Coordinates of C-alpha atoms and ligand atoms in Angstrom, one line a residue:
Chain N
X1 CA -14.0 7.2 4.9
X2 CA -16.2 8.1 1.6
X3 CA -18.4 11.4 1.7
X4 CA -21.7 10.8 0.3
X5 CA -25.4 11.7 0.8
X6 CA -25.8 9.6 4.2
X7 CA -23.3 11.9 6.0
X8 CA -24.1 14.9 4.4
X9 CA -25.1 17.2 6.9
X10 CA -21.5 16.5 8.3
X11 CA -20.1 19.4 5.4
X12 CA -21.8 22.1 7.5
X13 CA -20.8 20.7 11.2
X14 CA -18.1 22.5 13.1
X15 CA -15.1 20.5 12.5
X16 CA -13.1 22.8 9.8
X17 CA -13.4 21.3 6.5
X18 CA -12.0 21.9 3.0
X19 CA -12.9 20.1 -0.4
X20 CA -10.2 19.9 -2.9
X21 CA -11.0 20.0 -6.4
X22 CA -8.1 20.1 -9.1
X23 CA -9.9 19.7 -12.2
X24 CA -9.0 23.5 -13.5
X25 CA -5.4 23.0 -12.5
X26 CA -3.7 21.7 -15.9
X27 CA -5.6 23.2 -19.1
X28 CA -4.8 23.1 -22.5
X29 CA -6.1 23.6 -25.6
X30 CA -5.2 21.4 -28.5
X31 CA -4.4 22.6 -32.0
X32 CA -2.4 21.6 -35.2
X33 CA 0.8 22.4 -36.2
X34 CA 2.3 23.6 -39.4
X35 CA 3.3 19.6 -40.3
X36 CA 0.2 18.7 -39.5
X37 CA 1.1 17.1 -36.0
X38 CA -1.0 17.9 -32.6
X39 CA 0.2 19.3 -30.0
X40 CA -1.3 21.1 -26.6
X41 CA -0.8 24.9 -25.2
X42 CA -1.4 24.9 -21.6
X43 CA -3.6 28.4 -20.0
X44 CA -3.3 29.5 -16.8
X45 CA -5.1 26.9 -14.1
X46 CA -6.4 26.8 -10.3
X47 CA -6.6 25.1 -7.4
X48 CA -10.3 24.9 -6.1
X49 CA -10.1 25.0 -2.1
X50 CA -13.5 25.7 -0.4
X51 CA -14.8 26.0 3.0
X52 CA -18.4 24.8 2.8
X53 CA -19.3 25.7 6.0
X54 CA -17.8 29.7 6.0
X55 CA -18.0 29.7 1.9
X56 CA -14.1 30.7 2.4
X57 CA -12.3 30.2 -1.1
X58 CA -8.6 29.7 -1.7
X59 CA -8.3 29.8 -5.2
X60 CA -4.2 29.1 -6.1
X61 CA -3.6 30.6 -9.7
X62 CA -1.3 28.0 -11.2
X63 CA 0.8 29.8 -13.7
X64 CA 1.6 28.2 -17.0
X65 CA 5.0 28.3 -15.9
X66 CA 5.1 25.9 -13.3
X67 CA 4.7 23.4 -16.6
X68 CA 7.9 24.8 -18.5
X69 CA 10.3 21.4 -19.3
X70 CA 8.2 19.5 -17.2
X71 CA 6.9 16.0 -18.2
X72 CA 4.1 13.8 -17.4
X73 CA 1.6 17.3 -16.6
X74 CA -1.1 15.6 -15.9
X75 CA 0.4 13.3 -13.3
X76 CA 2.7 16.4 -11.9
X77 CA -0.6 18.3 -11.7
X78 CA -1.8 16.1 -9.0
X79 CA 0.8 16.6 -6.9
X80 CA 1.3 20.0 -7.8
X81 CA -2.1 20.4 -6.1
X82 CA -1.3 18.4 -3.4
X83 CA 1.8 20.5 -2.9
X84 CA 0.3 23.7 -2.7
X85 CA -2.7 22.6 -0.5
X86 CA 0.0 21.1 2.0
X87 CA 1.5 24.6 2.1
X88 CA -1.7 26.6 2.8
X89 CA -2.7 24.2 5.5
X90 CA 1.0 24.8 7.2
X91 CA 0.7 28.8 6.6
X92 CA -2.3 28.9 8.3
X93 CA -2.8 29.0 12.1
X94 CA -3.3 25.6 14.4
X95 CA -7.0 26.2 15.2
X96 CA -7.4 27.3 11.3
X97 CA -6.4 24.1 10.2
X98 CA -8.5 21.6 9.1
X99 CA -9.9 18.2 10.4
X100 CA -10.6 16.8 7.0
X101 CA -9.9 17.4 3.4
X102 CA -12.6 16.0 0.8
X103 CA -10.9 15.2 -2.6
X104 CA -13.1 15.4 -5.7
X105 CA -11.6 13.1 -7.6
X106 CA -9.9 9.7 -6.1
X107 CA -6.6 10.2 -7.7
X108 CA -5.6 13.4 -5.2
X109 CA -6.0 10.5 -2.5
X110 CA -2.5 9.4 -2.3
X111 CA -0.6 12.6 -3.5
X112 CA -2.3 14.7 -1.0
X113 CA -2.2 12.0 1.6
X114 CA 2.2 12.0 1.0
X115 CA 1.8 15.5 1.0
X116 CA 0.4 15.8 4.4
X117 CA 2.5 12.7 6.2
X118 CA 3.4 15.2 9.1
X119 CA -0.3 16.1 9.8
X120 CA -1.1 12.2 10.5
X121 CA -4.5 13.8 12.3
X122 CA -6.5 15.4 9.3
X123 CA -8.7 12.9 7.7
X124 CA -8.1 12.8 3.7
X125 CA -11.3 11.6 1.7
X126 CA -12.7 11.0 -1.4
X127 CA -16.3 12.0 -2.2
X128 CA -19.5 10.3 -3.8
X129 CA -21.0 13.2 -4.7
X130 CA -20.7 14.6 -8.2
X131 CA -20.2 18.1 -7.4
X132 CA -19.5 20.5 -10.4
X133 CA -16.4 22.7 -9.2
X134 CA -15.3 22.4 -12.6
X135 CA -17.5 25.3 -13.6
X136 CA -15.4 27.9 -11.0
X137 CA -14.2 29.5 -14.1
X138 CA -17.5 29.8 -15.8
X139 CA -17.5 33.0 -12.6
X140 CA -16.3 35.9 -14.1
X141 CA -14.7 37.7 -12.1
X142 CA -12.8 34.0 -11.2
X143 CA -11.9 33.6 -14.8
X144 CA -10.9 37.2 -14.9
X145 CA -7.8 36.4 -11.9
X146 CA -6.9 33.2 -13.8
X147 CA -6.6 34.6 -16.6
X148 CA -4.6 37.7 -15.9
X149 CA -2.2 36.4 -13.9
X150 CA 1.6 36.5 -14.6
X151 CA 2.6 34.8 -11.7
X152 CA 1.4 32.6 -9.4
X153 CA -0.8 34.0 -6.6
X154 CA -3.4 32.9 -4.2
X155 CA -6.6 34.9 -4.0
X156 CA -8.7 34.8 -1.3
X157 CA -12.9 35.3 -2.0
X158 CA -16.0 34.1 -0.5
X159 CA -18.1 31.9 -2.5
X160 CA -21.7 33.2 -1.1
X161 CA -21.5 36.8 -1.2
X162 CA -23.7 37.5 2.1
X163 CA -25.9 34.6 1.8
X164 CA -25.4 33.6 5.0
X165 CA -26.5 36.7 6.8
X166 CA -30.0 35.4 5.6
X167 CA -29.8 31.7 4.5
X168 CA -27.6 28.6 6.4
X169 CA -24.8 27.0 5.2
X170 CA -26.7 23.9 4.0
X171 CA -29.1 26.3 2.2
X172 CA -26.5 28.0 0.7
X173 CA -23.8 25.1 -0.8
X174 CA -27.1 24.2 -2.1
X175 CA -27.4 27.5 -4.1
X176 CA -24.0 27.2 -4.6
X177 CA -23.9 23.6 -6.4
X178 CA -26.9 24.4 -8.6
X179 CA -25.8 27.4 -9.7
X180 CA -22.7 25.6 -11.0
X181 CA -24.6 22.7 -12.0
X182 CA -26.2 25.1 -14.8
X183 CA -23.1 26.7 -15.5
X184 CA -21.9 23.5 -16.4
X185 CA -24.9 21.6 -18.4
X186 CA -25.5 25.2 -20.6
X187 CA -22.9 28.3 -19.2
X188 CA -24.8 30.3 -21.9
X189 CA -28.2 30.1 -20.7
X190 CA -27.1 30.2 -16.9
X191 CA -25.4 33.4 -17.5
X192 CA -28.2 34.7 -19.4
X193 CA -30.8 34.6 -16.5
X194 CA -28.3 35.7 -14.1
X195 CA -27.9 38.9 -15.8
X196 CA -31.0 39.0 -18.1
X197 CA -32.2 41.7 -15.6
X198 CA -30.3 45.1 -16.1
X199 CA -31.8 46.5 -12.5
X200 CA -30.0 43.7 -10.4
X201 CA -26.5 44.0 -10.4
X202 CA -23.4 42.4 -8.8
X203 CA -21.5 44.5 -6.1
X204 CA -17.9 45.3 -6.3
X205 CA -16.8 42.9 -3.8
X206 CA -19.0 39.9 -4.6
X207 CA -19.3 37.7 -7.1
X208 CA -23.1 36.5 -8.2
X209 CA -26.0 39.3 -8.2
X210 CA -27.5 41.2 -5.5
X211 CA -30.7 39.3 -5.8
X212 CA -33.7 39.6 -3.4
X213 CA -35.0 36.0 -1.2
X214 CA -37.8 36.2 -3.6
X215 CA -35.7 36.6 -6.3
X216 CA -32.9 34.1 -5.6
X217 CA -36.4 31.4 -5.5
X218 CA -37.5 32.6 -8.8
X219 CA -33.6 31.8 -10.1
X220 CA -33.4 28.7 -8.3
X221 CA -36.4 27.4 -10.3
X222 CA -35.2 29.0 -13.6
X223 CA -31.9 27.1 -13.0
X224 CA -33.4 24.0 -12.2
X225 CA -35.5 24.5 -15.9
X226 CA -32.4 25.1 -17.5
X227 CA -31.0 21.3 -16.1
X228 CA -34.2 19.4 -16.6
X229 CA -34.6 21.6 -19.8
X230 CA -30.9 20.1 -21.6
X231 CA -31.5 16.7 -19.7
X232 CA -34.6 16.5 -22.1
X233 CA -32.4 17.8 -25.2
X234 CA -29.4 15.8 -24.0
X235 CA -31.5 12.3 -23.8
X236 CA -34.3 12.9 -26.1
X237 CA -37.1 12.9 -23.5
Chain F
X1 CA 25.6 -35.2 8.2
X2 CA 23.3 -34.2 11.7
X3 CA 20.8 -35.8 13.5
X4 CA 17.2 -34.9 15.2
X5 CA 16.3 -37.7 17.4
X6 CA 12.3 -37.8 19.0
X7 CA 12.0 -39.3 22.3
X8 CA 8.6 -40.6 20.4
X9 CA 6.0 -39.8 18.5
X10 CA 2.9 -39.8 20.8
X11 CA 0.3 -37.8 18.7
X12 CA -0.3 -38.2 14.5
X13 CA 1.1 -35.8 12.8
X14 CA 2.6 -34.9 10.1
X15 CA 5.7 -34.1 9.8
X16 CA 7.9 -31.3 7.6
X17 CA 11.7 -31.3 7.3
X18 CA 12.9 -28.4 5.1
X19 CA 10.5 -28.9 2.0
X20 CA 9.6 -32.8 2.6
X21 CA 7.1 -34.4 4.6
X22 CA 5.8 -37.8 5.8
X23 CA 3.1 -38.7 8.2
X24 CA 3.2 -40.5 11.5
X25 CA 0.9 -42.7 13.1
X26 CA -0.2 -42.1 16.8
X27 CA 2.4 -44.4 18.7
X28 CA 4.5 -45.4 15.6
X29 CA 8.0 -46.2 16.8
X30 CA 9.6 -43.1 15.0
X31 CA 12.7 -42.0 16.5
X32 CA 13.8 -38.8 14.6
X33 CA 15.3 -37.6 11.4
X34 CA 18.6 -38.5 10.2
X35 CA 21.6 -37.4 7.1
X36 CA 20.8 -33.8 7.6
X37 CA 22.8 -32.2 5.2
X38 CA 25.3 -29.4 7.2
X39 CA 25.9 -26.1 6.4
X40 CA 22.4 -24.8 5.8
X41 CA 19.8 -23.7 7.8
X42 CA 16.6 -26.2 8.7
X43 CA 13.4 -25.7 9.4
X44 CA 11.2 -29.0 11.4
X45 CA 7.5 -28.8 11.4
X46 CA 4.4 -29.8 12.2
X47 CA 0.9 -30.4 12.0
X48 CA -1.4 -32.6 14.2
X49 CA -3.6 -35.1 12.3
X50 CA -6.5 -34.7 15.0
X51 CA -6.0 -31.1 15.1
X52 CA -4.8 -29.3 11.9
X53 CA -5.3 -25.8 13.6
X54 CA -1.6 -24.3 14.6
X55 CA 1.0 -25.5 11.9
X56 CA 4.3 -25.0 14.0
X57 CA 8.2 -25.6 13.8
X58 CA 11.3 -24.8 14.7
X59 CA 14.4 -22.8 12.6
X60 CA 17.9 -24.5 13.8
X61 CA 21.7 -25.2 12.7
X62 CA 22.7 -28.6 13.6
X63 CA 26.5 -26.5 13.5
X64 CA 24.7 -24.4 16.8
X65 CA 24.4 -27.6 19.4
X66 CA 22.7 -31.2 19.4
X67 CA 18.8 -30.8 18.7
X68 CA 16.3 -33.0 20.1
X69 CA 12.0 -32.9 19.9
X70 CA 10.1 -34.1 22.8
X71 CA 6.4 -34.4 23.0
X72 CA 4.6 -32.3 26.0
X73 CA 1.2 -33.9 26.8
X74 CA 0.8 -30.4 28.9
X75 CA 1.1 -27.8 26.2
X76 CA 0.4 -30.6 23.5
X77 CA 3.2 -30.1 21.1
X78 CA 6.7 -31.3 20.0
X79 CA 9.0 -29.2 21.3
X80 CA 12.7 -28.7 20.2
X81 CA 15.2 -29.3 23.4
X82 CA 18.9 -28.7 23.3
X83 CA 20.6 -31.7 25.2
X84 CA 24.4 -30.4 26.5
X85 CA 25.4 -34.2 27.0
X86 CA 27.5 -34.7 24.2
X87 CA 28.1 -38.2 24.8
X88 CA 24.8 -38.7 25.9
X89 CA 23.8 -37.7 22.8
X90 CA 25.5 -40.1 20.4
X91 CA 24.8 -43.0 21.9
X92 CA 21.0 -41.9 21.9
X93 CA 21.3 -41.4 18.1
X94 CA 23.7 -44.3 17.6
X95 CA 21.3 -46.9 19.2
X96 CA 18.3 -45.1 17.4
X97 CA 19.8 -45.5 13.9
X98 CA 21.3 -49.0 14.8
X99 CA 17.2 -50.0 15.4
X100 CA 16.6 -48.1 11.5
X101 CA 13.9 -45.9 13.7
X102 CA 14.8 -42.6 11.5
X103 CA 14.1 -41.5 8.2
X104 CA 16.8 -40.1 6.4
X105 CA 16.9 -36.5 5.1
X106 CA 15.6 -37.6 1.3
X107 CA 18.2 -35.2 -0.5
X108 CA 18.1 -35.9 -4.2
X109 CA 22.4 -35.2 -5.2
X110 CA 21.4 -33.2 -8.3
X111 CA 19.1 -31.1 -6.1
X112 CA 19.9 -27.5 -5.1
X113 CA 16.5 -26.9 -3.6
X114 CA 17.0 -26.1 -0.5
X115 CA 20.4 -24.4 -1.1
X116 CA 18.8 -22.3 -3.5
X117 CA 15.6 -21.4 -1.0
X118 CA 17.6 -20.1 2.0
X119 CA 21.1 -19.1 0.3
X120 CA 20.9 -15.8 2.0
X121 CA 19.5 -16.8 5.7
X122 CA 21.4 -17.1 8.6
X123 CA 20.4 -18.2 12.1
X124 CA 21.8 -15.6 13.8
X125 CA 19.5 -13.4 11.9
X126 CA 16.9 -15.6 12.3
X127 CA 17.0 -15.3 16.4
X128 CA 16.9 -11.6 15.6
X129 CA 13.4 -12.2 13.9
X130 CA 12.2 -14.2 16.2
X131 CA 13.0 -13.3 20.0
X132 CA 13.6 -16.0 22.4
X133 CA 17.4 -15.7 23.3
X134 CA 18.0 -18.8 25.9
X135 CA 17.6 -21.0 22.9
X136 CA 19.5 -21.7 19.8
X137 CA 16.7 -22.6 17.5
X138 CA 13.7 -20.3 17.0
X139 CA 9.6 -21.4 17.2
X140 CA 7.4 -20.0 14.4
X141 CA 3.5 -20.5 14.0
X142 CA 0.7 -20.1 11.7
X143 CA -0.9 -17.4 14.2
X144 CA 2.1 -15.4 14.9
X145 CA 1.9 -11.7 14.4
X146 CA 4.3 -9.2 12.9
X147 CA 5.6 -5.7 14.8
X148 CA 3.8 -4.2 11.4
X149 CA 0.6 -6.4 12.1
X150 CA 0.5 -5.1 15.9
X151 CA 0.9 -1.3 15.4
X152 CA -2.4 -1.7 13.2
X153 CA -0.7 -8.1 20.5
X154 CA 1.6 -9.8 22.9
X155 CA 5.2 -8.4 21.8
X156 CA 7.2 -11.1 23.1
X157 CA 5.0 -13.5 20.3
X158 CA 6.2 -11.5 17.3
X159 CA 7.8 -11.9 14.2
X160 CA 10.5 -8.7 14.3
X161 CA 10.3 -8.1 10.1
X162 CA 11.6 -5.3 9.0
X163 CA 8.9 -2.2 9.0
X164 CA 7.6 -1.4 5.3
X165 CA 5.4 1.3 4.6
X166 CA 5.5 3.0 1.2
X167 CA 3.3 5.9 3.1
X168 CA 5.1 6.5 5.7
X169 CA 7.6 9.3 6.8
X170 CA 10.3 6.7 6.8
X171 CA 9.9 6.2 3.3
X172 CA 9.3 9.3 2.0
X173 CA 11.7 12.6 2.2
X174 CA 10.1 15.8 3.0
X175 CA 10.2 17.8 -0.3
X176 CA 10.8 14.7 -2.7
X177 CA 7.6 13.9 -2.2
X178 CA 6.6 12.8 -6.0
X179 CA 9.5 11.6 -6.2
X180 CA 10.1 9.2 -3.6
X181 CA 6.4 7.8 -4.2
X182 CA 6.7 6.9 -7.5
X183 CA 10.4 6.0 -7.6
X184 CA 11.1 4.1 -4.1
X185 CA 14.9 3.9 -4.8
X186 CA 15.9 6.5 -2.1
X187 CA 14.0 3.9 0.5
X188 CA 15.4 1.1 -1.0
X189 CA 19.2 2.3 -0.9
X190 CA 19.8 4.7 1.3
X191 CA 16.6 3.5 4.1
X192 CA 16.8 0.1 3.9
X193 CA 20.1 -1.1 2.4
X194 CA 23.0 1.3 4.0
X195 CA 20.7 2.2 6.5
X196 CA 18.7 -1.1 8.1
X197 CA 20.0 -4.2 6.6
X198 CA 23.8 -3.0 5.9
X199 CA 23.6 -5.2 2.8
X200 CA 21.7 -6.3 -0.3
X201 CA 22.6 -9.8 1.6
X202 CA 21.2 -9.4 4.8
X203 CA 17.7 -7.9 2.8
X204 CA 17.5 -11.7 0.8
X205 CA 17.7 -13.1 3.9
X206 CA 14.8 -11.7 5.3
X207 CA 12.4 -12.1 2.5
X208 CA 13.7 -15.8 2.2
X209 CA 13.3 -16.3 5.6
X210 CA 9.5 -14.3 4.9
X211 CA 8.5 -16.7 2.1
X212 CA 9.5 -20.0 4.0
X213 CA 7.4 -18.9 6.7
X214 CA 4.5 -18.3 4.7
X215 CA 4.6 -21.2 2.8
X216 CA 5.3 -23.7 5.4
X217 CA 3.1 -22.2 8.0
X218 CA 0.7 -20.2 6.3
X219 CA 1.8 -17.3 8.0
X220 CA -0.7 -14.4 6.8
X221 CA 1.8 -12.0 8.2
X222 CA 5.1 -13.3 6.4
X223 CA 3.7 -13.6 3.4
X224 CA 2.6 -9.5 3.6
X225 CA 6.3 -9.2 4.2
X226 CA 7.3 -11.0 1.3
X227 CA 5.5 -9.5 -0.8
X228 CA 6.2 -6.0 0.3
X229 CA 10.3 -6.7 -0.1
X230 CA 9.6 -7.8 -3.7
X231 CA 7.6 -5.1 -4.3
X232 CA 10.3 -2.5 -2.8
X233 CA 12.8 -3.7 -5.7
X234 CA 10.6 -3.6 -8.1
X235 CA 9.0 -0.1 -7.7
X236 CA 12.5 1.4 -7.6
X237 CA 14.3 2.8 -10.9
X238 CA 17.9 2.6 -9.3
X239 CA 18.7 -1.1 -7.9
X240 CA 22.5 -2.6 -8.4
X241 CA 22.3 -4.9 -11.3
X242 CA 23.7 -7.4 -8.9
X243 CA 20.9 -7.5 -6.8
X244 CA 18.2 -7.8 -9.6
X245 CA 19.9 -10.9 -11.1
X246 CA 19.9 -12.2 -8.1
X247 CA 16.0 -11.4 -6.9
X248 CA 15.3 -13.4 -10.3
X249 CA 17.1 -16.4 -9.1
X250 CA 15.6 -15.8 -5.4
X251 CA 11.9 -16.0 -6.6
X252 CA 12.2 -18.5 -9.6
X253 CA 12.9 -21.3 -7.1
X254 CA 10.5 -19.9 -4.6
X255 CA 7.7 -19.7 -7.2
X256 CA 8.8 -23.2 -8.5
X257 CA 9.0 -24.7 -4.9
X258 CA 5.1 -23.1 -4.2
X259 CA 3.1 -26.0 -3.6
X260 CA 0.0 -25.3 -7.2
X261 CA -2.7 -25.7 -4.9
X262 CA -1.6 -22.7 -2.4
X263 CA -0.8 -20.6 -4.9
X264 CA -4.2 -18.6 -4.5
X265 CA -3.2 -18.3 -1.0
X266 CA 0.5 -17.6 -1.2
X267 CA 0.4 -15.2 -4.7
X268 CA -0.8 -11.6 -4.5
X269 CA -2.7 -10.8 -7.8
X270 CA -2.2 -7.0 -7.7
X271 CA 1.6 -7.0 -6.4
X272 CA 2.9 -9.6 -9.0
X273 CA 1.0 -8.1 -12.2
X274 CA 2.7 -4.8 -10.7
X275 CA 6.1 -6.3 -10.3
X276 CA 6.0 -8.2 -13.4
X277 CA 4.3 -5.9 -16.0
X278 CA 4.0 -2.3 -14.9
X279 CA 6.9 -2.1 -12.6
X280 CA 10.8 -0.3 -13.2
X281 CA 11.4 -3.5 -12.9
X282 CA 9.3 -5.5 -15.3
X283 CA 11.7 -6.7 -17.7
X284 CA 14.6 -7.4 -15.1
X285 CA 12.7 -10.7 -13.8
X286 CA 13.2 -13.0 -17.0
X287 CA 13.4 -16.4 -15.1
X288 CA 10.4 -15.3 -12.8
X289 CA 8.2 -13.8 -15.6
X290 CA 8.7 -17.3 -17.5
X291 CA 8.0 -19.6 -14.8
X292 CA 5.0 -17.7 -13.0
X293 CA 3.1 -16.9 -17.3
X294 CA 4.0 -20.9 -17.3
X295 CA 2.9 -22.2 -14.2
X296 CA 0.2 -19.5 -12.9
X297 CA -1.5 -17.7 -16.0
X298 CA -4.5 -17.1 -14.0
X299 CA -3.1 -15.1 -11.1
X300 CA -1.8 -12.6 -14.6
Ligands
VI8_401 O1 -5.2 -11.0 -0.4 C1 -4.8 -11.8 -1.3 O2 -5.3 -12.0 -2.4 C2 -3.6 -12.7 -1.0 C3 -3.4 -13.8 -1.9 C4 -2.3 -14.5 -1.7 C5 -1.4 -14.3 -0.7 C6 -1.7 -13.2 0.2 N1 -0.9 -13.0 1.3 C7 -1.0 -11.8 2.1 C8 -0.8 -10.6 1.2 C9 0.3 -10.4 0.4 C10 0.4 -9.2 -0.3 C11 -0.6 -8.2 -0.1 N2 -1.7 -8.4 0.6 C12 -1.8 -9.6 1.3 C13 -2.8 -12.4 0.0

């Protein structure tokens, strides 16, 4: 059924797995016009599609073309999404395919499950965990794809760098959600002590810095500062 | 006009015809039912006063063969019996009325009730439902099961509706995905009417015959197809303006003819304030919307 804390070891199990998260998919920004009306101007989105057992991304770039004298975007987004994750399950091989798909939010339940009729054996769920895939495009170079894109395209990256050559998968969606957590409650400061330090850099093909074990502690306290830090501003504690 | 005729009534029960009922004592000299008005479909039913577990009955056509219910002390119910003796028949009835042992069918004239409840069923269609084909009238129960209810158990038990399921390949076609799910009108017309039923006649039928069953025999099953017929119609943008007059008319006289006090067990909150007030449909059901805002406020 639900995904929650109880089962939560079950993420990092064998059985192939993806969560879905469409929150980045339709974006706009809203502005006036000259008679004084609103109206919206949708950016480039993305489809969030992770493994969180192999960190395996498939981020779709959703071009703000696919939007052009369409109606009702924020409906057709959801099934936009459930469109495209239909066709990356069929293109890739059988024992590739997933067993379950974990939805972030409740409404991709039934347009992914219509989607996927003709797989009647992978599992479509929702989630109770709040997990903060919103902030994908608070990473760089992910906000760098998005945004250049003139078509649509699917880039393929791994989420963890090389954590796991030293760290588990558990240990490392861990890493993973507080580091977005913090991206999301203050992108500012997060970015700030991810880089603050000239002498650690990010390599070419990865994505956060190349930081030492000791290191990535030191962060992962600084991070969780940062949270507890705008909880206390955010609440007045 | 027809006649049932009861070897006797050895158990108290009570005792439907269509949408009346009376009670009968244990060993009261009752004899049957008479003036059965021809040309519609019937339904006789029961429900034992010592036992009120298993409401049962019996769909016939008194056009379809001479009808008869006999008491079985082995399975302990009425049972309906065809009797091929014509003349043995009549002069069974004849002596039976002549003794004023039978109530009479207690048709007001003005009254269009019943026409109005089952002017789309048949009992061919009927024994099509419900499959027992070396008799002419067909058994229903509270307990019985639907094909849908079994796939999610004894087949020969069922109650053959029509399969609805709005996810389900049937329903939906492969790259009109969206489409299909929010606007069912492709499953509606194409699926179900030229496909299934043939006609927007034969579809009536069914959820008439669907509604009866629920509400005479609480049929948990028959009311989910009910339900799931209106809510087919109502979820589609493209429906023949025909057949959304006449779904108006359809369910007006059901929802009048709902006994108040079931209507928490016979009316689906979430599918009605769909059908009525978020639905394609929602302002094609003027009769309906008035009586159910009227009559059950609460349920909207
Ligand atoms: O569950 C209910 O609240 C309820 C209330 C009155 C009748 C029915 N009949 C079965 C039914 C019909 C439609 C959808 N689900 C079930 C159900």
């Amino acid at each position: 059924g639900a995904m929650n804390s109880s089962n939560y070891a079950e993420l990092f199990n064998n059985d192939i797995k993806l969560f879905v998260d469409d929150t980045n998919v339709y974006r706009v920004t809203v502005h006036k016009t000259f008679e004084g009306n609103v109206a919206t101007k949708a950016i480039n989105g993305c489809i969030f599609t992770l493994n969180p057992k192999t960190g395996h991304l498939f981020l779709k770039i959703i071009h703000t073309s696919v939007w052009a004298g369409q109606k009702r975007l924020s409906q057709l987004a959801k099934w936009k999404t459930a469109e495209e994750v239909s066709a990356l399950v069929r293109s890739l091989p059988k024992e590739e395919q997933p067993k379950q798909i974990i939805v972030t939010r409740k409404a991709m339940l039934d347009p992914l499950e219509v989607h996927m009729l003709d797989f009647p054996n992978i599992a479509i769920r929702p989630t109770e965990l709040r997990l903060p895939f919103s902030a994908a495009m608070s990473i760089d170079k992910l906000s760098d794809v998005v945004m250049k894109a003139t078509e649509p395209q699917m880039v393929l990256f791994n989420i963890y760098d090389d954590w796991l050559d030293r760290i588990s998968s558990y240990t490392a969606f861990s890493r993973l959600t507080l580091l977005l957590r913090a991206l999301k409650t203050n992108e500012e400061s997060a970015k700030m002590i991810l880089l603050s330090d000239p002498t650690i850099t990010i390599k070419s093909y990865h994505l956060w810095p190349s930081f030492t074990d000791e290191q990535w502690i030191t962060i992962e306290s600084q991070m969780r500062d940062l949270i507890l830090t705008e909880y206390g501003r955010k609440y007045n504690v | 006009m027809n006649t049932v005729p009861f070897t006797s009534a050895p158990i108290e029960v009570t005792i439907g015809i269509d949408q009346y009922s009376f009670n009968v004592k244990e060993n009261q000299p009752f004899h049957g039912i008479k003036d059965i008005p021809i040309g519609h479909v019937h339904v006789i039913h029961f429900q034992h006063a010592d036992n009120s577990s298993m409401r049962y009955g019996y769909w016939f056509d008194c056009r379809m063969g001479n009808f008869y219910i006999q008491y079985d002390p082995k399975d302990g119910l009425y049972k309906m019996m065809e009797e091929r003796d014509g003349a043995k028949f009549e002069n069974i009835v004849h002596n039976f009325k002549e003794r004023q042992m039978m109530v009479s069918y207690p048709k007001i004239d003005e009254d269009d009730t019943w026409y109005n409840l089952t002017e789309f069923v048949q009992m061919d269609k009927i024994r099509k439902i419900v499959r027992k084909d070396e008799n002419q009238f067909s058994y229903v129960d509270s307990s019985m099961t639907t094909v849908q209810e079994n796939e999610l158990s004894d087949p020969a038990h069922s109650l053959n509706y029509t399969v609805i399921n709005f996810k389900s390949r049937e329903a939906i076609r492969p790259g009109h995905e969206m489409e299909d799910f929010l606007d069912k009108s492709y499953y509606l017309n194409t699926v179900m009417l030229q496909g299934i039923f043939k006609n927007s006649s034969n579809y009536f039928g069914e959820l008439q015959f669907a509604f009866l069953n629920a509400m005479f025999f609480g049929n948990y099953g028959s009311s989910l197809q009910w339900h799931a017929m209106i809510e087919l119609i109502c979820s589609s943008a493209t429906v023949p303006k025909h057949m959304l007059d006449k779904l108006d008319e359809i369910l007006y006289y059901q929802i009048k003819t709902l006994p108040e006090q079931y209507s928490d067990i016979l009316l689906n909150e979430r599918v009605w304030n769909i059908c009525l007030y978020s639905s394609f449909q929602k302002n094609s059901l003027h009769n309906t919307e008035k009586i159910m805002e009227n009559k059950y406020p609460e349920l909207l």
